[PDB]
Amino acid sequence: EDAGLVAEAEAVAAGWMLDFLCLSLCRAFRDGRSEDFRRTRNSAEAIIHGLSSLTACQLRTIYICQFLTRIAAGKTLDAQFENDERITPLESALMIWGSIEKEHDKLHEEIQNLIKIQAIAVCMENGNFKEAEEVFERIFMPFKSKLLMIISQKDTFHSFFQHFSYNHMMEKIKSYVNYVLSEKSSTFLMKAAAKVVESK
Amino acid sequence: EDAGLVAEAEAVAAGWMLDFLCLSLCRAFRDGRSEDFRRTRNSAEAIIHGLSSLTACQLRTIYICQFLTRIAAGKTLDAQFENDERITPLESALMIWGSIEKEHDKLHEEIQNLIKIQAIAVCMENGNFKEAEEVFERIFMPFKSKLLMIISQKDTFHSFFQHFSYNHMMEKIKSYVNYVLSEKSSTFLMKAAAKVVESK
C-alpha cells in the first residue's frame, strides 16, 4: 500500500469534487435556491481544505465560488465578518472581482460598477445611512458629489439607484455565471452522474 | 434543462463523495493522521447535507463515520458537546456502536467492552475522578463494586485498566476499520482516481 499514491488519488478526487460543487453552486445561484446554495457553499469550502496546492484553473474556480459567496451575502449583516474584514460583503466581492484571472471586458466593467453602487444602496435599504457613507468613502469629482448628496438626503429610490439596481446587478452577475456553468457543465463528476441518471 | 434530472445527478454524486470520504476517513484513522482525519470529517459532514434520503448502505456509512468521529474525540474536552448531549464522546460512540446495522460478533463485543472501560479511564487520565464516577453511573454486582472501588481509589494504572487499555481499544477498532476500508476500497470515486494516478 503506497501512502504517496493514495494521497495523489485523493488530490485528484478533491479536484473533481471542487469542479462538481462549483457547477452546483453556480446553478443554485442562478435558480435562487438559497438553502441549496448555502449547503453547496459549505461543502465546497470544506473540500478545498483537502488541497494544499492548486493549479491556475483551480484558483480561478475557488475565487469564482468566493465571489458568489460574497454576492449572496450582500444584504446580510454579519458582525463577525465586519469585525474581521473591516468592510461589507459587497466590498469584499468587489476585491475578489478585481483580482480574478479573467478578461476585463464590457461585462466585467458592468458587474464592477453595479457592485460599487449596490454596496452603498444595500446599506440605505437596511436603514444604515452612516454605513452607506463609510462604504462610499472606502470605494470612492462632480459624480462623487452627486452620489454623496443622494446618500446624505436618504434618497434611496433616486433614478440613478433605480438604473444601477440590485436586480440589474443580479441579472448581470447571472449572465457571467451562465458562461462558467457552460464551461464546467462537462466536468468528470457531473458528466458521470448524468450518465447514470440517463441509464435509469 | 430538467431541474429534476440535475437534482438526481447531484444526489448520485453526493453518494459517490460520501463513499470516497468514508474511505479517506478510515485511512486517516488507521494511519493516525489527525489533521487529515479532521479535514475529511468536516468534508463528509458537509457532503451528507446534500442528501435528504439515504439507503440502508448509506446510513451504515454515515454511522461508521459518526462513530469514528466520537472515538477520535475520546480524550478531548468539549463543553458545548457535554452540554448538548449530557455525556462524553466515548459514551456517544457507545450509543452509535450499539445501534449500527451490523453483526454482534466477538469483535463487536470486544470493541463495546473496551469503549465502556475507556469512557471511565480517559476521565481518570485527565484527572477528573468525579466525571469518571458519573460516566460509571451512566454505563453501569461484584464486578461493578470492584470497578467503582478502583475509580474511588484513583487507581488509574490498576491491572484491569492495563488489560482494557486505550491502545487495546484503538487496535481492536482499527481491525474493524480494516474490514470497512477493504469493503469500500473499490468504490467509484477512489477507483477512478486510482486509474488516473496509475496512468501518470
Ligand SMILES: Cc1occc1C(=O)NCc1ccco1
Ligand atoms: C471554495 C469555496 O467555495 C464556496 C465557498 C468557498 C470558500 O472558500 N469560502 C470562503 C470565502 C468566501 C469569501 C472569501 O473566502
Ligand SMILES: Cc1occc1C(=O)NCc1ccco1
Ligand atoms: C457523516 C459524517 O462523516 C464524518 C462526520 C459525519 C457527521 O455526520 N458528523 C456528525 C456527528 C458525529 C457524531 C454524531 O454526529
